[PDB]
Amino acid sequence: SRQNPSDLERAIAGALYDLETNTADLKAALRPLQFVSAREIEVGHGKKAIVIFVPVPALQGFHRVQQRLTRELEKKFSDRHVLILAARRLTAVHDAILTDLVYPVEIVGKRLRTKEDGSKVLKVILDEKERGGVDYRLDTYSEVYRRLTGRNVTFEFPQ
């Protein structure tokens, strides 16, 4: 691919290696995966959340298997929010970035509301069926999107 390893790149490489071996009994797109890409920029204050960039059909491979893979990554890796994405290089690209940010849940609506002046605010409303375990991830989603693309959004559940 592209990457010569850095201090967390070799870390995620060793992490995926010990998810291959010494465990499950579940390895589908893990063995056809090598070093891919990773990034660690802070979220909030004090906390961090790791994002990884994956080649484009392995995204649907990881959508086949992302449940409890991400959980094990969170627990055995530094106690932070793990996150997976597609690597790319336009508004459709931002659309794909958002829909790949929110991995188990489907987005529903994009409300682009202008204020009383030229300012405008974009708010994405999600599905109501998954609300319990994503509300604490909402801010991480917002700041990750902000850091990668630059447009400020805000994630919300409908009512």
Partner: protein, 126 residues
Amino acid sequence: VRTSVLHDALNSINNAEKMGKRQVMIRPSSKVIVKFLQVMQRHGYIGEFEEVDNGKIVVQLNGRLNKCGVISPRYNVRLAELEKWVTKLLPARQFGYVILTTSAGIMDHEEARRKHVAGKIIGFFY
């Protein structure tokens, strides 16, 4: 069928401000309607609008505007022509505005006279 989606949306706006509603559901959205709402929001004839998707526009309005429309031949217009055009179009020089898809975008006539850019007279509201 009037392919002028701009005229459809403005017809719904005039119907709403006539009936006394507070918010509208403009069903077919487009960027020209978005910028037209932008300039009416600049001049404060509309509260606050949002564009949602399947998309449509929801426009909280206060009830200050009287009439809106679109100039169907979309006539190109220079500066002295602009002055006489705006006095022939609005009921007063100090009430209402006329809209120009200039080469610098979409703006009102006072902004056109500030930036010294002419363009195509397209729409108007007062």
